[PDB]
């Protein structure tokens, strides 16, 4: 048995009105702990917000869309509990209007497109971004983060930003979004579907 310990924590984030923001939190322990979200010191309702679980309840994602300045700008709190102890950690969301954007805020220069692939062949989803400084890229599939380090060689992110998927199978089907981040803020691409045929 052991007390819970964080292996992923949410960071401060600046987004754009009409857009999307996601926060991610995850912990280990024995028995497995349970994640819960709060807004301004009160528990969030799952019949009102989009909340998506993974790792048997030991990881969770809070997604907010479309962003609105008055309602959504606030302090958000993640908490993890098992029969041996409780730990917590917080982060702040800021939301900008179009005319407040600084010149180096990130942009999508070329985004991912619809793709139909035959089983057992390779599929590639492209993404090229710009800004100042140069942004870092990450990917989401059906609202959850993609982590290549667990595909045992199948799935990889290239230095250009593209996502490459070998030996395609039925579980690879779904809706993919590219995400670009730098010291000024965050921007999402439009979503694009992958289908597996024959």
Ligand X SMILES: O=S(=O)(O)OC[C@H]1O[C@](O)(COS(=O)(=O)O)[C@@H](OS(=O)(=O)O)[C@@H]1OS(=O)(=O)O
Q: Residue 48 or residue 197: which is nearer to ligand X going by CB?
A: 48
Question: Token pair of 141, please?
Answer: 């599939």
Q: Residue 71 or residue 159: which is nearer to ligand X going by CB?
A: 71
Rg of the chain on CA atoms, in Å: 18
Q: Is 40 annotated as a binding residue?
A: yes
Classify the C-alpha dihedral 24-188-161-127 as positive or negative: positive
Q: Residue 46 or residue 183: which is nearer to ligand X going by CB?
A: 46
Residues between 21 and 40 with contacts to ligand X, criterion CB under 6 A? 39
Residues between 129 and 188 with contacts to ligand X, criterion CB under 6 A? none
Question: Token pair of 132, please?
Answer: 């100042």
Q: Is 141 annotated as a binding residue?
A: no
123-137 core/surface letters (b: 16 or more CB in 10 A; e: else): bebebebebeeebeb
Q: Is 71 in the site for ligand X (CB under 6 A)?
A: yes
Q: Is 119 annotated as a binding residue?
A: no
Q: Is 63 in the site for ligand X (CB under 6 A)?
A: no
Nearest to 28 by CA among 61, 59, 60: 59
User: Which residue number is nearest to ligand X in terms of Cβ?
Assistant: 71
Residues forming contacts to ligand X in the complex (CB under 6 A) are 39, 48, 71
Which residues define the annotated binding site? 39-48
């Amino acid at each position: 048995d052991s007390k819970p310990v964080f292996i992923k924590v949410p960071e401060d984030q600046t987004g754009l009105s009409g857009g999307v923001a996601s926060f991610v939190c995850q912990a280990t322990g024995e028995p497995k702990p349970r994640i819960t979200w709060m807004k301004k010191g009160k528990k969030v309702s799952s019949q009102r917000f989009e909340v998506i679980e993974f790792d048997d309840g030991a990881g969770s994602v809070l997604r907010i869309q479309p962003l609105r300045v008055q309602r959504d700008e606030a302090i958000y709190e993640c908490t993890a509990t098992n029969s041996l102890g409780e730990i917590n950690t917080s982060a702040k969301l800021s939301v900008l209007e179009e005319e407040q954007l600084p010149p180096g805020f990130p942009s999508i220069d070329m985004g991912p497109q619809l793709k139909v692939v035959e089983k057992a062949r390779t599929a590639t989803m492209l993404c090229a971004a710009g800004g100042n400084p140069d942004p870092e890229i990450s990917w989401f599939k059906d609202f959850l983060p993609v982590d290549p380090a667990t595909s045992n060689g199948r799935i990889k992110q290239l230095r250009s930003g593209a996502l490459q998927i070998e030996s395609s199978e039925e579980s690879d089907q779904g809706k993919y979004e590219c995400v670009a981040t730098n010291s000024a803020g965050t921007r999402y691409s439009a979503p694009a579907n992958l289908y597996v045929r024959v």
